[PDB]
Amino acid sequence: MAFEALTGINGDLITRSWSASKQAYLTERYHKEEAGAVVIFAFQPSFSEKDFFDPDNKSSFGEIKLNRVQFPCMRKIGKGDVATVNEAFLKNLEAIIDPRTSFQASVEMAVRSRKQIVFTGHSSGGATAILATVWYLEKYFIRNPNVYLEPRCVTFGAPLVGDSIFSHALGREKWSRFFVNFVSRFDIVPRIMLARKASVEETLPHVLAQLDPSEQRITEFYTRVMRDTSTVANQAVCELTGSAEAFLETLSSFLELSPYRPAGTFVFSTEKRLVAVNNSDAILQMLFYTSQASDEQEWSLIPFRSIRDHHSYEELVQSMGKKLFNHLDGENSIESTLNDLGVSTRGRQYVQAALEEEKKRVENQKKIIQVIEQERFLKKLAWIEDEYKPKCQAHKNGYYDSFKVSNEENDFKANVKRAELAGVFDEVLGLMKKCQLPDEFEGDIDWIKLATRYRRLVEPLDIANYHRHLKNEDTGPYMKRGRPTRYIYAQRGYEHYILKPNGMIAEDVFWNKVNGLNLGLQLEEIQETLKNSGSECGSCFWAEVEELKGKPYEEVEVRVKTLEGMLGEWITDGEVDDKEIFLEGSTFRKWWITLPKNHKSHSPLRDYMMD
Amino acid sequence: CRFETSELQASVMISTPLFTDSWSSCNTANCNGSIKIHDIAGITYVAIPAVSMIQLGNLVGLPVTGDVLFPGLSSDEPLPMVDAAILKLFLQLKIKEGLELELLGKKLVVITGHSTGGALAAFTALWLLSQSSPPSFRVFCITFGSPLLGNQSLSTSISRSRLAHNFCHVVSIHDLVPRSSNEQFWPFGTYLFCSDKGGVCLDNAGSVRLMFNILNTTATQNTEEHQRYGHYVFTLSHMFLKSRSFLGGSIPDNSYQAGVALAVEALGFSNDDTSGVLVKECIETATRIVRAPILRSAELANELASVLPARLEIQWYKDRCDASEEQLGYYDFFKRYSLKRDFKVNMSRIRLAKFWDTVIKMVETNELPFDFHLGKKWIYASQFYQLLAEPLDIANFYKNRDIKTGGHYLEGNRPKRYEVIDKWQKGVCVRSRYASTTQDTCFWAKLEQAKEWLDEARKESSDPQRRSLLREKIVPFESYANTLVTKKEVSLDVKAKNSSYSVWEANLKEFK
């Protein structure tokens, strides 16, 4: 049906996932189920407040930052900020992973059999399932991406797991299509983690024990949960439309708001409709607005239904076939759908605002692509490649030195083109920071190629500019406080793109290579000397050179050896041009020939320079 | 234009714990009858009780000699005035001593009050936020039905300082107290107009005043609507349980018009009554007035980006001039002669002067945000432009002058843009080498002045008194020049052998 086309999971897989989640109540920490070519790893739900909030976690939402080595991809590639997940769920997952269990061995055995891996779960088990899938994606899919190695994740009323960076990382890697989170309209569990710990500390255990398969307590818990949900939804919609910047900024110090956000495709379910949503902000607004009470009778009934709907997934999966399905993000007349799901006119306004912000992001990406396609823009890079560089290497000094010293009309127009390109790229960066571009823009192949080309071509010109105006005498070293943010962003995007198949972090690879260079100093002082060094990026080569040409040798011996070691691979990759840096008038050669004859002999670059 | 945020901002404010906590503190302070300081959820609340008095409506300027000083609000030309009774009660209650000592150690402080207590709480928050240094904690003020505090100059001074978002004034559409003060009184800070159905925020003083006028002319009258603030807070804080559709009529298909209709119905008026149409027009006008400065700032940023090649041209011209063999400096290369390079740098200078004239004139006219010049981007842009281009403008002026009637550059001939840029830069060690550009922008103008002065001093040799006096006014110029060059805060083109500075130096020393 249309559901299978949109989500990639049919009714058979959903029914099997639900059955596995049912049998997961008994078995300890997970339950593997075989059916044809499909193996399902259901996870056991748990109904103790120690399992939703971590007792030793002194935060009011029970959240913790992921380690960028266990889940390396779950972060902001340009910014560097890692994702955040519920600590209790992560601890449960890490208990399930531990080599002292058979989970990892069974997963490897299922991967080797070319089976379809499905992680499924109910309540807290659904949250674990989500985490497990990401684990799988960080460990097997990204290492050798094949169609068979594609997992599926099916959760039934699962709580929120990660923050906005989690969902952004899922969407950038194009993994959000794998996750499917069935939510029944009034189920309180998907909205519980939107409250503060202090708001529900007194009433959580009773309601949790009631969820496990006083009316005052249930009503009070529902009221507090929905109050915090309303605050979070209002602040979120007010922020994503850029409304009231200063007002929100001043309240933000006084506001303590849940960070958890929907991740993956959600499917809201009624007695007659089945609405699929892929927009995380639209799902947050729907979570708030689909459980408000129409009138006093329904208000009296909501706290009961909010708990009996946590056990309605049996009927949901049995009767999914005879429900009218539609896709919210796809269709444009969202009025009838949301009205049937019980959203009010104001709620409809805010859901529509979320969807239109997504469309604005898509159109911003289209504008950026159209700009970087214009020949006027491409001609600047072409001119720097074809007319500036060959002429400046015919003058026997290199374009870095020509730009930094000589005042040719060619140098002036190179400076002008540098400024205009920097303008275009700073504009795109400003769009990224304001979250105005789609999630996978940082993962686009065309953007990565073009940005890498621009960085490799022009960053030497920006370093020549930085040193021609003598900023290093007042603003400090370029690699410390002078480097433009867009250059770091481009470098990080390219590094992620190339190194993510091997499951390594770029700085870890750099540290492995420098350790392999076998310097004369041990780990602590080499790590201390290579602080803000210009040897972590090829395009910053010249920056490091300007930090080394004025200093005595013995102070910079380790840095010079690091530069020597990185040069070969930099030249091979094309990060550093070889026809430029080895010319007679080049600054690098002139400084290098001043090094001691001992180093000049034992350096790996005798064959390039004569004295 | 596209999104209605007035009702949303109000919903954001209503949904917070600060709302109900502030009202609870106000109720406790009213019941006890004195100032209370309380801690809820890690936030400190200063609740100031409603104090009965006899006089309200007399404005007095802010006190410059007293324990209660206001360094922040003294810029507005018409001295910011406040209600006299409020300040007198501030002194009588000794809030300063009883507050600055009891809030030590706190990190989040909310100040709140009902009726007169609200006007006092706004005054005290303004005092805390208006000291010479920002306080050790962040201060937010919430007032409930407070009468207006000061005059329009005070409101403009608050808004220009970016303090208006630290104030929220909940006002019922039937509370007559804030709507009835003397017309010399002006509001400030975000106002939350609420009713039984919802709230709407307005953060523009003029639009708030228009809303007050509309409410006065149309809405009903009562006095217990001021004691209904308890019911209003409770009713507003529990709408998240209820789905609130647009009751009565069908929303416009447009998103912005539907938002405006929802806001109008939140205030309680129908979209078919004269009150409804007046309120809807007020809301639309307020959103437009908020929107316009951001659009103008974006357009000016685009225009600044489009102009950068001109500044690059002037930088190149300086480089080629001080890299040339005549060694005149770009000042003299631009003033003495007229070459192709001089023609092109003239074109770039004209473009730069035009653009920055437009920017300054838009800033002064108040078509741009008050936080415009405080932004460090425009600080850098103006700084670099002034440093590179002002000597060129001085060269142009003394090139196109009459030697006597043209006078001089600083004595009333300087463009207003450079003075405004001086304001902007001031509003925000020895140098190892020479500076890239001369730090004293008007250096060359003063040099031309001193050249005329020395011409006059040598013009007469039979008036030793005039020689002595011209020497008295020549010595501070050469002292200033020596101070500028010793610190090496001048570009190398000032020391060029054929630069006008060098020949004037030689002439003055041979003159002694």
Side-chain angles (χ1 to χ4, degrees), chain A residues 227 231 234 241 246-247 249-250 253-255 292-293 345-346 407 412 473, chain B residues 7 9 11 15 108 138 165 240-241 243-244 246 262 312-313 316 319 433:
Chain A
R227 168 183 317 250
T231 310
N234 288 343
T241 78
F247 173 66
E249 190 277 331
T250 62
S253 289
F254 294 82
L255 290 191
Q292 291 174 329
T345 313
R346 297 165 157 83
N407 262 295
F412 173 69
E473 293 179 353
Chain B
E7 214 223 293
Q9 187 178 0
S11 293
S15 53
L108 307 173
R138 308 235 290 167
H165 303 290
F240 64 88
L241 302 162
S243 73
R244 288 189 299 141
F246 172 80
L262 292 169
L312 297 184
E313 181 65 26
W316 178 32
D319 288 330
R433 291 196 191 173

mmCIF file of all heavy atoms in Angstrom, chain A residues 227 231 234 241 246-247 249-250 253-255 292-293 345-346 407 412 473, chain B residues 7 9 11 15 108 138 165 240-241 243-244 246 262 312-313 316 319 433:
data_model
loop_
_atom_site.group_PDB
_atom_site.id
_atom_site.type_symbol
_atom_site.label_atom_id
_atom_site.label_comp_id
_atom_site.label_asym_id
_atom_site.label_seq_id
_atom_site.Cartn_x
_atom_site.Cartn_y
_atom_site.Cartn_z
ATOM 1 N N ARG A 227 1.327 20.266 31.102
ATOM 2 C CA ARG A 227 1.763 21.642 31.302
ATOM 3 C C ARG A 227 3.175 21.846 30.771
ATOM 4 O O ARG A 227 3.444 22.800 30.025
ATOM 5 C CB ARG A 227 1.676 22.001 32.784
ATOM 6 C CG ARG A 227 2.362 23.293 33.156
ATOM 7 C CD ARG A 227 2.294 23.522 34.650
ATOM 8 N NE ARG A 227 0.970 23.217 35.176
ATOM 9 C CZ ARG A 227 0.115 24.130 35.622
ATOM 10 N NH1 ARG A 227 0.447 25.412 35.605
ATOM 11 N NH2 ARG A 227 -1.072 23.760 36.081
ATOM 12 N N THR A 231 4.439 24.164 27.504
ATOM 13 C CA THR A 231 5.530 25.131 27.536
ATOM 14 C C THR A 231 6.569 24.822 26.464
ATOM 15 O O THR A 231 7.008 25.716 25.729
ATOM 16 C CB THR A 231 6.177 25.148 28.917
ATOM 17 O OG1 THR A 231 5.161 25.287 29.916
ATOM 18 C CG2 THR A 231 7.152 26.302 29.031
ATOM 19 N N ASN A 234 5.169 25.507 22.861
ATOM 20 C CA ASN A 234 5.063 26.934 22.589
ATOM 21 C C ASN A 234 6.430 27.541 22.330
ATOM 22 O O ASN A 234 6.619 28.282 21.359
ATOM 23 C CB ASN A 234 4.380 27.644 23.755
ATOM 24 C CG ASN A 234 2.912 27.337 23.836
ATOM 25 O OD1 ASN A 234 2.314 26.854 22.882
ATOM 26 N ND2 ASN A 234 2.318 27.616 24.982
ATOM 27 N N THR A 241 10.255 29.856 14.093
ATOM 28 C CA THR A 241 9.820 30.904 13.185
ATOM 29 C C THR A 241 10.581 32.202 13.396
ATOM 30 O O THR A 241 10.259 33.207 12.756
ATOM 31 C CB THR A 241 8.321 31.162 13.330
ATOM 32 O OG1 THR A 241 8.084 31.961 14.495
ATOM 33 C CG2 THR A 241 7.556 29.861 13.441
ATOM 34 N N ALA A 246 14.567 38.545 21.179
ATOM 35 C CA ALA A 246 15.091 39.066 22.436
ATOM 36 C C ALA A 246 14.235 38.636 23.619
ATOM 37 O O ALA A 246 14.759 38.356 24.702
ATOM 38 C CB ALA A 246 15.196 40.587 22.372
ATOM 39 N N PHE A 247 12.916 38.581 23.435
ATOM 40 C CA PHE A 247 12.033 38.137 24.508
ATOM 41 C C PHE A 247 12.340 36.698 24.902
ATOM 42 O O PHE A 247 12.480 36.375 26.090
ATOM 43 C CB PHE A 247 10.586 38.279 24.056
ATOM 44 C CG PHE A 247 9.586 37.711 25.011
ATOM 45 C CD1 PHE A 247 9.407 38.273 26.260
ATOM 46 C CD2 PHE A 247 8.806 36.631 24.652
ATOM 47 C CE1 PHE A 247 8.477 37.763 27.132
ATOM 48 C CE2 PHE A 247 7.877 36.117 25.525
ATOM 49 C CZ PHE A 247 7.707 36.689 26.762
ATOM 50 N N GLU A 249 15.150 35.161 24.329
ATOM 51 C CA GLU A 249 16.500 35.102 24.870
ATOM 52 C C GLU A 249 16.540 35.522 26.333
ATOM 53 O O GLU A 249 17.311 34.957 27.117
ATOM 54 C CB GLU A 249 17.437 35.969 24.035
ATOM 55 C CG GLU A 249 18.912 35.795 24.365
ATOM 56 C CD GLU A 249 19.361 36.627 25.549
ATOM 57 O OE1 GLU A 249 18.765 37.699 25.786
ATOM 58 O OE2 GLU A 249 20.314 36.210 26.241
ATOM 59 N N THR A 250 15.739 36.512 26.720
ATOM 60 C CA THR A 250 15.709 36.907 28.123
ATOM 61 C C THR A 250 14.971 35.899 28.992
ATOM 62 O O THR A 250 15.387 35.661 30.130
ATOM 63 C CB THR A 250 15.084 38.291 28.284
ATOM 64 O OG1 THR A 250 13.725 38.260 27.834
ATOM 65 C CG2 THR A 250 15.863 39.324 27.497
ATOM 66 N N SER A 253 16.989 32.224 30.237
ATOM 67 C CA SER A 253 17.694 32.022 31.497
ATOM 68 C C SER A 253 16.755 31.611 32.616
ATOM 69 O O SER A 253 17.199 30.992 33.587
ATOM 70 C CB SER A 253 18.446 33.289 31.900
ATOM 71 O OG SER A 253 19.554 33.523 31.053
ATOM 72 N N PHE A 254 15.472 31.941 32.503
ATOM 73 C CA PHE A 254 14.481 31.599 33.508
ATOM 74 C C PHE A 254 13.694 30.345 33.162
ATOM 75 O O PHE A 254 12.898 29.888 33.986
ATOM 76 C CB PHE A 254 13.507 32.767 33.704
ATOM 77 C CG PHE A 254 14.139 33.989 34.297
ATOM 78 C CD1 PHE A 254 14.836 34.877 33.504
ATOM 79 C CD2 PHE A 254 14.038 34.247 35.648
ATOM 80 C CE1 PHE A 254 15.422 35.998 34.049
ATOM 81 C CE2 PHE A 254 14.624 35.365 36.196
ATOM 82 C CZ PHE A 254 15.315 36.240 35.395
ATOM 83 N N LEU A 255 13.898 29.783 31.975
ATOM 84 C CA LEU A 255 13.135 28.641 31.495
ATOM 85 C C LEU A 255 14.000 27.389 31.487
ATOM 86 O O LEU A 255 15.167 27.429 31.087
ATOM 87 C CB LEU A 255 12.586 28.897 30.092
ATOM 88 C CG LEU A 255 11.478 29.938 30.015
ATOM 89 C CD1 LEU A 255 10.831 29.912 28.646
ATOM 90 C CD2 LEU A 255 10.461 29.669 31.102
ATOM 91 N N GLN A 292 -5.350 17.486 23.657
ATOM 92 C CA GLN A 292 -6.177 18.438 24.379
ATOM 93 C C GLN A 292 -7.631 17.992 24.342
ATOM 94 O O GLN A 292 -8.062 17.288 23.426
ATOM 95 C CB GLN A 292 -6.052 19.835 23.781
ATOM 96 C CG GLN A 292 -4.717 20.495 23.996
ATOM 97 C CD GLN A 292 -4.618 21.809 23.265
ATOM 98 O OE1 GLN A 292 -5.221 21.987 22.211
ATOM 99 N NE2 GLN A 292 -3.866 22.742 23.825
ATOM 100 N N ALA A 293 -8.390 18.417 25.345
ATOM 101 C CA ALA A 293 -9.772 17.990 25.495
ATOM 102 C C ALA A 293 -10.716 18.917 24.744
ATOM 103 O O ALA A 293 -10.613 20.143 24.843
ATOM 104 C CB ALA A 293 -10.157 17.941 26.972
ATOM 105 N N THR A 345 -7.721 25.047 15.831
ATOM 106 C CA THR A 345 -7.287 25.976 14.793
ATOM 107 C C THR A 345 -5.916 26.565 15.102
ATOM 108 O O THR A 345 -5.087 26.726 14.200
ATOM 109 C CB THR A 345 -8.322 27.083 14.614
ATOM 110 O OG1 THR A 345 -9.629 26.505 14.540
ATOM 111 C CG2 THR A 345 -8.057 27.844 13.337
ATOM 112 N N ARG A 346 -5.659 26.904 16.365
ATOM 113 C CA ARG A 346 -4.342 27.408 16.738
ATOM 114 C C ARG A 346 -3.276 26.328 16.597
ATOM 115 O O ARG A 346 -2.175 26.586 16.086
ATOM 116 C CB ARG A 346 -4.389 27.949 18.164
ATOM 117 C CG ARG A 346 -5.331 29.122 18.323
ATOM 118 C CD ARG A 346 -5.643 29.405 19.770
ATOM 119 N NE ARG A 346 -6.083 30.781 19.970
ATOM 120 C CZ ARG A 346 -7.327 31.206 19.782
ATOM 121 N NH1 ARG A 346 -8.268 30.361 19.385
ATOM 122 N NH2 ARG A 346 -7.630 32.477 19.990
ATOM 123 N N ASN A 407 51.990 43.907 -5.784
ATOM 124 C CA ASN A 407 50.718 44.666 -5.923
ATOM 125 C C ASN A 407 50.315 44.732 -7.398
ATOM 126 O O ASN A 407 50.005 45.843 -7.870
ATOM 127 C CB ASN A 407 50.874 46.100 -5.419
ATOM 128 C CG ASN A 407 50.369 46.284 -4.006
ATOM 129 O OD1 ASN A 407 49.178 46.137 -3.747
ATOM 130 N ND2 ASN A 407 51.271 46.594 -3.089
ATOM 131 N N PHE A 412 45.256 42.335 -7.186
ATOM 132 C CA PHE A 412 44.083 43.059 -6.710
ATOM 133 C C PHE A 412 42.796 42.337 -7.087
ATOM 134 O O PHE A 412 41.884 42.204 -6.264
ATOM 135 C CB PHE A 412 44.073 44.481 -7.265
ATOM 136 C CG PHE A 412 42.817 45.228 -6.952
ATOM 137 C CD1 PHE A 412 42.536 45.613 -5.658
ATOM 138 C CD2 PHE A 412 41.903 45.518 -7.946
ATOM 139 C CE1 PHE A 412 41.381 46.287 -5.361
ATOM 140 C CE2 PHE A 412 40.742 46.191 -7.653
ATOM 141 C CZ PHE A 412 40.481 46.575 -6.358
ATOM 142 N N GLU A 473 50.408 39.866 14.706
ATOM 143 C CA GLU A 473 51.050 40.671 15.732
ATOM 144 C C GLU A 473 50.077 41.228 16.761
ATOM 145 O O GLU A 473 50.517 41.644 17.838
ATOM 146 C CB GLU A 473 51.826 41.827 15.090
ATOM 147 C CG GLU A 473 53.021 41.369 14.274
ATOM 148 C CD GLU A 473 53.769 42.512 13.631
ATOM 149 O OE1 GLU A 473 53.290 43.662 13.712
ATOM 150 O OE2 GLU A 473 54.838 42.261 13.039
ATOM 151 N N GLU B 7 -0.083 36.691 19.522
ATOM 152 C CA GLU B 7 -0.812 35.717 20.376
ATOM 153 C C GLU B 7 0.152 34.622 20.845
ATOM 154 O O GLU B 7 0.000 34.158 21.988
ATOM 155 C CB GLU B 7 -1.977 35.109 19.593
ATOM 156 C CG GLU B 7 -3.189 34.811 20.454
ATOM 157 C CD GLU B 7 -3.851 33.474 20.176
ATOM 158 O OE1 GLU B 7 -4.413 33.312 19.075
ATOM 159 O OE2 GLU B 7 -3.805 32.598 21.061
ATOM 160 N N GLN B 9 3.529 34.814 21.396
ATOM 161 C CA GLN B 9 4.370 35.341 22.463
ATOM 162 C C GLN B 9 3.623 35.354 23.792
ATOM 163 O O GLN B 9 4.186 35.013 24.841
ATOM 164 C CB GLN B 9 4.839 36.742 22.087
ATOM 165 C CG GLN B 9 5.847 37.341 23.019
ATOM 166 C CD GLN B 9 6.309 38.698 22.553
ATOM 167 O OE1 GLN B 9 5.867 39.190 21.519
ATOM 168 N NE2 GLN B 9 7.197 39.317 23.317
ATOM 169 N N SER B 11 1.131 33.342 24.604
ATOM 170 C CA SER B 11 1.009 31.950 25.030
ATOM 171 C C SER B 11 2.307 31.449 25.646
ATOM 172 O O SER B 11 2.289 30.716 26.643
ATOM 173 C CB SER B 11 0.604 31.070 23.852
ATOM 174 O OG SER B 11 -0.701 31.380 23.412
ATOM 175 N N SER B 15 2.453 30.170 29.541
ATOM 176 C CA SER B 15 2.730 28.772 29.841
ATOM 177 C C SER B 15 3.875 28.571 30.826
ATOM 178 O O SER B 15 4.078 27.444 31.283
ATOM 179 C CB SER B 15 3.035 28.011 28.550
ATOM 180 O OG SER B 15 4.052 28.659 27.815
ATOM 181 N N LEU B 108 18.875 34.092 39.722
ATOM 182 C CA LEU B 108 17.705 34.474 38.941
ATOM 183 C C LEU B 108 16.730 35.181 39.864
ATOM 184 O O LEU B 108 16.289 34.601 40.859
ATOM 185 C CB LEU B 108 17.045 33.258 38.292
ATOM 186 C CG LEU B 108 17.943 32.344 37.460
ATOM 187 C CD1 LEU B 108 17.182 31.109 37.031
ATOM 188 C CD2 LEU B 108 18.476 33.084 36.257
ATOM 189 N N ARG B 138 20.383 37.864 36.850
ATOM 190 C CA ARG B 138 19.516 38.399 35.817
ATOM 191 C C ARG B 138 18.168 38.764 36.416
ATOM 192 O O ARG B 138 17.635 38.045 37.265
ATOM 193 C CB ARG B 138 19.344 37.421 34.656
ATOM 194 C CG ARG B 138 20.656 36.914 34.098
ATOM 195 C CD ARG B 138 20.727 37.178 32.607
ATOM 196 N NE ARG B 138 19.821 36.358 31.816
ATOM 197 C CZ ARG B 138 19.535 36.602 30.541
ATOM 198 N NH1 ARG B 138 20.077 37.645 29.931
ATOM 199 N NH2 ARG B 138 18.701 35.814 29.878
ATOM 200 N N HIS B 165 12.737 44.292 27.124
ATOM 201 C CA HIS B 165 12.303 42.900 27.146
ATOM 202 C C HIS B 165 12.481 42.287 28.526
ATOM 203 O O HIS B 165 12.171 41.110 28.737
ATOM 204 C CB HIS B 165 13.054 42.103 26.084
ATOM 205 C CG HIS B 165 12.888 42.654 24.706
ATOM 206 N ND1 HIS B 165 11.696 42.584 24.018
ATOM 207 C CD2 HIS B 165 13.751 43.312 23.897
ATOM 208 C CE1 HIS B 165 11.837 43.160 22.839
ATOM 209 N NE2 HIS B 165 13.074 43.609 22.740
ATOM 210 N N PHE B 240 -4.109 25.040 28.456
ATOM 211 C CA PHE B 240 -3.426 23.960 27.758
ATOM 212 C C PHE B 240 -4.222 22.666 27.807
ATOM 213 O O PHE B 240 -4.016 21.789 26.964
ATOM 214 C CB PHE B 240 -2.021 23.756 28.331
ATOM 215 C CG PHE B 240 -1.996 23.303 29.762
ATOM 216 C CD1 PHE B 240 -2.038 21.959 30.080
ATOM 217 C CD2 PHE B 240 -1.905 24.221 30.789
ATOM 218 C CE1 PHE B 240 -2.009 21.546 31.388
ATOM 219 C CE2 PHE B 240 -1.877 23.808 32.099
ATOM 220 C CZ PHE B 240 -1.928 22.471 32.398
ATOM 221 N N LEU B 241 -5.132 22.534 28.770
ATOM 222 C CA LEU B 241 -5.989 21.358 28.826
ATOM 223 C C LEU B 241 -7.083 21.404 27.770
ATOM 224 O O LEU B 241 -7.591 20.355 27.364
ATOM 225 C CB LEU B 241 -6.609 21.234 30.216
ATOM 226 C CG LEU B 241 -5.642 21.133 31.392
ATOM 227 C CD1 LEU B 241 -6.357 21.468 32.679
ATOM 228 C CD2 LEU B 241 -5.040 19.747 31.467
ATOM 229 N N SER B 243 -8.796 22.417 24.060
ATOM 230 C CA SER B 243 -8.610 22.765 22.658
ATOM 231 C C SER B 243 -9.424 24.015 22.356
ATOM 232 O O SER B 243 -10.612 24.079 22.679
ATOM 233 C CB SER B 243 -9.032 21.612 21.751
ATOM 234 O OG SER B 243 -10.441 21.484 21.719
ATOM 235 N N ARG B 244 -8.791 25.005 21.740
ATOM 236 C CA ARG B 244 -9.387 26.321 21.531
ATOM 237 C C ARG B 244 -9.465 26.594 20.034
ATOM 238 O O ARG B 244 -8.529 27.125 19.435
ATOM 239 C CB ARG B 244 -8.581 27.392 22.243
ATOM 240 C CG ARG B 244 -8.709 27.367 23.747
ATOM 241 C CD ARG B 244 -8.057 28.583 24.352
ATOM 242 N NE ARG B 244 -6.635 28.643 24.037
ATOM 243 C CZ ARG B 244 -5.984 29.761 23.742
ATOM 244 N NH1 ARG B 244 -6.627 30.917 23.717
ATOM 245 N NH2 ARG B 244 -4.688 29.721 23.469
ATOM 246 N N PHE B 246 -11.222 28.402 16.571
ATOM 247 C CA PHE B 246 -11.731 29.715 16.192
ATOM 248 C C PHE B 246 -13.251 29.659 16.192
ATOM 249 O O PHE B 246 -13.866 29.217 15.217
ATOM 250 C CB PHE B 246 -11.177 30.097 14.823
ATOM 251 C CG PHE B 246 -11.766 31.347 14.238
ATOM 252 C CD1 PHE B 246 -11.319 32.592 14.639
ATOM 253 C CD2 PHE B 246 -12.734 31.277 13.255
ATOM 254 C CE1 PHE B 246 -11.845 33.737 14.090
ATOM 255 C CE2 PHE B 246 -13.258 32.421 12.705
ATOM 256 C CZ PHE B 246 -12.817 33.651 13.125
ATOM 257 N N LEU B 262 -7.305 35.050 14.890
ATOM 258 C CA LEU B 262 -7.195 34.317 16.146
ATOM 259 C C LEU B 262 -6.767 35.232 17.286
ATOM 260 O O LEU B 262 -7.280 35.120 18.401
ATOM 261 C CB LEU B 262 -6.222 33.154 15.996
ATOM 262 C CG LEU B 262 -6.689 32.026 15.084
ATOM 263 C CD1 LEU B 262 -5.540 31.082 14.816
ATOM 264 C CD2 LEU B 262 -7.862 31.286 15.690
ATOM 265 N N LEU B 312 38.225 47.764 -1.038
ATOM 266 C CA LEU B 312 39.396 47.037 -1.519
ATOM 267 C C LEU B 312 40.213 47.886 -2.486
ATOM 268 O O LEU B 312 41.448 47.857 -2.458
ATOM 269 C CB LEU B 312 38.959 45.730 -2.173
ATOM 270 C CG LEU B 312 38.270 44.772 -1.203
ATOM 271 C CD1 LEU B 312 37.940 43.455 -1.877
ATOM 272 C CD2 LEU B 312 39.132 44.553 0.021
ATOM 273 N N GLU B 313 39.536 48.643 -3.352
ATOM 274 C CA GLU B 313 40.214 49.575 -4.247
ATOM 275 C C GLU B 313 41.002 50.622 -3.479
ATOM 276 O O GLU B 313 42.133 50.947 -3.851
ATOM 277 C CB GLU B 313 39.199 50.257 -5.162
ATOM 278 C CG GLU B 313 39.809 51.237 -6.159
ATOM 279 C CD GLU B 313 40.713 50.593 -7.180
ATOM 280 O OE1 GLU B 313 40.531 49.395 -7.471
ATOM 281 O OE2 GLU B 313 41.612 51.292 -7.691
ATOM 282 N N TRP B 316 44.081 48.999 -2.085
ATOM 283 C CA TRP B 316 45.070 48.808 -3.140
ATOM 284 C C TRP B 316 45.740 50.121 -3.508
ATOM 285 O O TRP B 316 46.939 50.157 -3.798
ATOM 286 C CB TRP B 316 44.417 48.199 -4.378
ATOM 287 C CG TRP B 316 45.362 48.016 -5.527
ATOM 288 C CD1 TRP B 316 46.695 47.744 -5.454
ATOM 289 C CD2 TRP B 316 45.048 48.100 -6.920
ATOM 290 N NE1 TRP B 316 47.230 47.649 -6.711
ATOM 291 C CE2 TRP B 316 46.239 47.864 -7.631
ATOM 292 C CE3 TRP B 316 43.876 48.353 -7.636
ATOM 293 C CZ2 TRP B 316 46.292 47.872 -9.020
ATOM 294 C CZ3 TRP B 316 43.931 48.360 -9.015
ATOM 295 C CH2 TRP B 316 45.129 48.121 -9.692
ATOM 296 N N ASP B 319 48.287 50.863 -1.028
ATOM 297 C CA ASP B 319 49.432 49.973 -1.196
ATOM 298 C C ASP B 319 50.321 50.420 -2.349
ATOM 299 O O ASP B 319 51.549 50.462 -2.222
ATOM 300 C CB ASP B 319 48.949 48.539 -1.403
ATOM 301 C CG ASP B 319 48.393 47.927 -0.132
ATOM 302 O OD1 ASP B 319 48.851 48.317 0.959
ATOM 303 O OD2 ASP B 319 47.495 47.066 -0.222
ATOM 304 N N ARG B 433 55.163 47.920 15.904
ATOM 305 C CA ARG B 433 55.462 48.491 14.602
ATOM 306 C C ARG B 433 54.528 49.668 14.357
ATOM 307 O O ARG B 433 53.706 50.027 15.205
ATOM 308 C CB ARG B 433 55.323 47.445 13.490
ATOM 309 C CG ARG B 433 56.381 46.361 13.518
ATOM 310 C CD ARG B 433 56.428 45.614 12.199
ATOM 311 N NE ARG B 433 57.255 44.415 12.278
ATOM 312 C CZ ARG B 433 57.358 43.513 11.307
ATOM 313 N NH1 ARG B 433 56.681 43.670 10.178
ATOM 314 N NH2 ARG B 433 58.136 42.451 11.467
#
